């Protein structure tokens, strides 16, 4: 469970039995034909896979390139999170667990988890941070409609990190009945491998679709990176393929302003939620609060596989600011009629940061941005626009 020096199982000792039980159960389904049949049948009929590779003609003409969008926004619940939530709650039910817990910031992973819990008829308790938006109010009503319990997180600054903290305390105090569902590729082994292996269907589908459109592998593949599950899903089948893989972290107000979530670019090696990885820290090793106009990227850590990919040069990493992501949000809505998630808008914004004239670019559209409409229109950068 080590990606070079990163990863590991840096957890309280009482969690070692659950991690070893999870690792053994996951190793059993690796060859189980029945599991992958029930899972892939749900990905097709319940989630909507395979998602199409859409040629954005008007976006391509603006940049003088051939830009393709991997349409993960067309999935059920409207984000890639549904791919990981279905497979993990299914694994939980197969392991005999009767309760599901998870943490969420705005409510996206909470909705995807509560959706899979209602599909499999399991108890679901979601710990959610505080934000005064119609988006979160809708997610609360979604999760309550799906039958899940929502516990407003009051610890810390009531962020996604604080919600994950409360969900982990729930897991430890309910280890007999509860399965913990992480939202990204951040966590103790084998969680980063489990989440990535559930998301790599994105990159596998992409590898089969792009030669039908261009007769060759793409020149670039761009995806937004916070924890890194959607980027790892599309990057993994293309590792060491020669395709330029670019992960875009949240630059916030600026990489030198102290208000961002670029764990790889500005973080230090540390421990967060079970994994040794790059975390935003001060000089004394204390985790720092992240910031981003995108709630999905507002996380101070990054998956250990991305820290390994960055070190070995297999994936290139950069960041874009809040304003650049807001501009890409409006740009795709006007040019293609697709309202992208503010998370994926960071990857779309990077189309301006690379010389793509005449290049074939695939952008991972990780979700739709209807949840972000009020945040975008009320932002002072857009209001002044």
Binding residues among 263-292 for K ion as defined by CB under 5 A: 263
For residue 240, the SS3 value is coil
142 binds a second copy (CB under 8 A): yes
Q: How far apart are CA 3 and CA 383, in angstroms?
A: 44
List, as one string, the DSSP characters of 131-177: --SHHHHHHHHHHHHTT-EEEE--STT-SHHHHHHHHHHHHHTTTTT
Buried b (16+ CB within 10 A) or exposed e, 291-319: bbbbbbbbbbbbbbbbbbbbeeebbebbb
Stated as kind and residue range, the H or E segment containing 275 is strand 275-279
134 binds a second copy (CB under 8 A): yes
373 binds a second copy (CB under 8 A): yes
229 binds K ion (CB under 5 A): no
Q: How far apart are CA 278 and CA 6, in angstroms?
A: 9
88 binds K ion (CB under 5 A): no
211 binds a second copy (CB under 8 A): no
For residue 218, the SS3 value is coil
Q: Which stretch binds a second copy (CB under 8 A): 26-34, 47-55, 166-174, 314-322?
A: 47-55
118, 151, 193, 217: which one binds a second copy (CB under 8 A)? 118
String marking each residue 162-181 x if it binds a second copy according to CB under 8 A: --------------------
Q: How many residues are there in the chain?
A: 385
String marking each residue 252-271 x if it binds a second copy according to CB under 8 A: --------------------
Total residues interacting with K ion, rule: CB under 5 A: 5
151 binds a second copy (CB under 8 A): no
Give the position of tokens 């990077």.
350
Q: Which stretch binds a second copy (CB under 8 A): 40-48, 151-159, 236-244, 285-293?
A: 40-48
Q: Which residues bind a second copy (CB under 8 A)?
A: 44-46, 48, 51-55, 58, 71, 74-76, 114-119, 121, 134, 138, 141-142, 145-147, 330, 333-339, 370, 373-374, 376-377
């Amino acid at each position: 469970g080590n990606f070079g020096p990163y990863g590991g199982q840096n957890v309280p000792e009482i969690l070692m039995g659950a991690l070893e039980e999870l690792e053994a159960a996951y190793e059993g389904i690796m060859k189980d034909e029945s599991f992958w049949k029930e899972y892939n049948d749900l990905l097709r009929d319940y989630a909507g896979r395979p998602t199409p590779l859409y040629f954005a003609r008007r976006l391509s003409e603006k940049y003088g390139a051939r830009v393709y969008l991997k349409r993960e926004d067309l999935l059920h619940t409207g984000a890639h999170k549904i791919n990981n939530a279905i497979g993990q709650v299914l694994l939980a039910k197969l392991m005999g667990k009767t309760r599901i817990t998870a943490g969420t910031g705005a409510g996206q992973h909470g909705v995807a988890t509560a959706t899979a819990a209602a599909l499999f008829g399991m108890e679901c308790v979601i710990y959610m941070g505080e934000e005064d938006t119609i988006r979160q109010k809708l997610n609360v009503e979604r999760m309550k409609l799906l039958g899940a319990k929502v516990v407003p997180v009051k610890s810390g600054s009531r962020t996604l990190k604080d919600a994950i903290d409360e969900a982990l305390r729930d897991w430890i105090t309910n280890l007999q009945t509860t399965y913990y569902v992480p939202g990204s590729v951040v966590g103790p082994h084998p969680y980063p491998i489990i989440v990535r292996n559930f998301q790599k269907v994105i990159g596998e589908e992409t590898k089969k679709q792009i030669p039908e459109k261009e007769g060759r592998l793409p020149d670039y593949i761009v995806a937004c990176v916070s924890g890194g599950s959607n980027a790892a899903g599309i990057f993994y089948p293309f590792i060491d393929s020669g395709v330029k893989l670019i992960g875009v972290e949240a630059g916030g107000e600026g990489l030198e302003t102290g208000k961002h979530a670029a764990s790889l670019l500005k973080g230090k090696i540390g421990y967060l939620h079970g994994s040794k990885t790059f975390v935003l820290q001060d000089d004394w090793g204390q985790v720092q609060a992240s910031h981003s106009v995108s709630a999905g990227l507002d996380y101070p850590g990054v998956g250990p596989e991305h820290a390994y990919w960055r070190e070995t040069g297999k994936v290139l990493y950069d960041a874009v600011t809040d304003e650049e992501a807001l501009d890409a949000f409006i740009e795709l809505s006007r040019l293609e009629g697709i309202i992208p998630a503010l998370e994926s808008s960071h990857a779309l914004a990077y189309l301006k940061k690379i010389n793509i004239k005449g290049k074939v670019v695939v952008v991972n559209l990780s979700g739709r941005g209807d949840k972000d409409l009020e945040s975008v229109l009320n932002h002072p950068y857009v209001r002044e626009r």
